[PDB]
Amino acid sequence: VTGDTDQPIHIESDQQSLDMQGNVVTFTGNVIVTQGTIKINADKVVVTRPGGEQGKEVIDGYGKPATFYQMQDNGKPVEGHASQMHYELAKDFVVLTGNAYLQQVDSNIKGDKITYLVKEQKMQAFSD
C-alpha cells in the first residue's frame, strides 16, 4: 500500500550474528521481516549496509521457499515465493529468484470458522 516503504522495518528471528566490521547482519531461524503490509519469511536474512551508509541497505532472504506478501492499494494482496528474496531499500522493487512465483488474490475471508462448498455441478447427466 502507499506508504509501506516509509515504514520502519521489523525483523524477528531465533538467532542473530554480525561480521567483524558490523555492516553485515545475519538472521536465522524462522525469520520474519515486515515493513507496513510487506512481509518476507525466510530461513536466513542478510542485511548489508555498505560502508555503514544509512539508506543503502540491502535485504536478502533465503528459504525453501522464502515467501513474500504485500497488500495493494487496489485491495488485492500480492503473494509469492522463490529461493531468494532481494530487496534493495533505495529501489522501488523486490526481486524473486529461483523457481519464482507471484500471484494476485481477488477475494478473501477470515474467521474462527469458515465453511467452503467443495462440490460443484456445472453439468449433470440424467439417464431416465
Binding site: 516503504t5 520502519p8 522495518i9 524477528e12 542473530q16 544509512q54
Partner: peptide, 18 residues
C-alpha cells in the same frame, strides 16, 4: 529518508536498532 531497521530476538524478547 532512510527508515530504521529494528531486530527482535525471539528467544530473549530483546530488540535493538541495527
Amino acid at each position: 529518508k532512510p527508515v530504521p531497521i529494528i531486530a527482535c530476538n525471539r528467544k530473549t524478547g530483546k530488540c535493538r536498532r541495527i
